[PDB]
Amino acid sequence: QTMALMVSIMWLCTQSMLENFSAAVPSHRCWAPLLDNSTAQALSPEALLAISIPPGPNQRPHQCRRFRQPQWQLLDPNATATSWSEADTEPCVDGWVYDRSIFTSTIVAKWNLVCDSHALKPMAQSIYLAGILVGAAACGPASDRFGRRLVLTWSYLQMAVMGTAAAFAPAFPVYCLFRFLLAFAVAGVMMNTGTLLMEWTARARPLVMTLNSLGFSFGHGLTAAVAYGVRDWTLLQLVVSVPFFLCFLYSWWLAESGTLLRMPGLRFRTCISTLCWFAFGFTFFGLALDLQALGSNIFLLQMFIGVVDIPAKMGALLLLSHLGRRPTLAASLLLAGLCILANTLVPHEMGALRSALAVLGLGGVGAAFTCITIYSSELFPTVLRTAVGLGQMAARGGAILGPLVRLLGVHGPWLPLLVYGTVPVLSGLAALLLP
């Protein structure tokens, strides 16, 4: 039925967005003896934190350096500011402490994802998306040979097992492998859902595609409340994977109660489609995974993203039916690109405006995804329609490369967002040439 696949391409969105909350990095500082030892450290904890940790980014105490000896020269206003030397610091050998106000436990606070290993979280997202790519590439022959229902049930069981395992992962590589297998099963379920919704009913293909997109949006909106309700990432993953264990009951229906010509032929349309899919993947899996910097409140940001993406992807079908495929797609791409660029243009103090621009950009890239999905069914004739598979593969590759460009934040906090805003502009300018 349609409602079952809607629930199960919600919970998939919930599982995908769980990385945006479980991998969130709270405000952390170096473990200092004058702040975490017994009472003998003494009053005025702010002064102790200032004299125990040097300043860093955003005029805040350095999250990566600690003073070996208390520098009393910094607290006295009669002494000059920034008088300490670099040799007085240490590379945080004693460890780090994290703020338990917003999140009680995360994968960053558990395995100490700090500046020395800050690339692990984008590397974790890249490994997750690589597992998605591997699953989407492998489940093809599996679904073609063993049947779609068998591979669907196996992928559901694998999802549940890997979620339950990652909810209690003792090490970082073990958690990475668990996420890799979970992404394999996620991509299997995604491919099965797509290939089933493409030919179950269909004239109603755009209608069922927009229904699946609205289900995805419902999942986007529900995962925010789920993360707001559960402050522990372990219990969060547990209660997110439990619905898959419940949906596993539908196995076996309650127990019975090649195509390489896409490159030479229509090469222009092919490369344009792969470029749009790559751009969509890039922006979506680079922006939806770092919502902490795009707004002030991650839960409210995701809620607004969902509540504004619902009508956007709703009216996307009206726009496609009235104005056409190419013009509305180019318009949505250019709008998303301009919004993400203005998100870097606006100062960081305008948090509400930054959040609104992020929501608008996410709605625009979702509308662009809907538009390219509708357009892929008509860009190529029936004799060439694995063009859609190549487009999805290019989108998954762009997704994989997504978190890898986030490492450019060392050279500047706007460079990843600058790329995420510049790519859709060129994507729309290239799609404007479509027939």
Ligand SMILES: O=C(O)CSc1nnc(Br)n1-c1ccc(C2CC2)c2ccccc12
């Ligand atoms: O075509 C493909 O299957 C890969 S496209 C892609 N890239 N990042 C992501 Br999230 N997705 C997406 C993958 C899958 C879906 C739906 C549930 C079936 C999505 C729905 C809306 C937006 C993006 C989606």
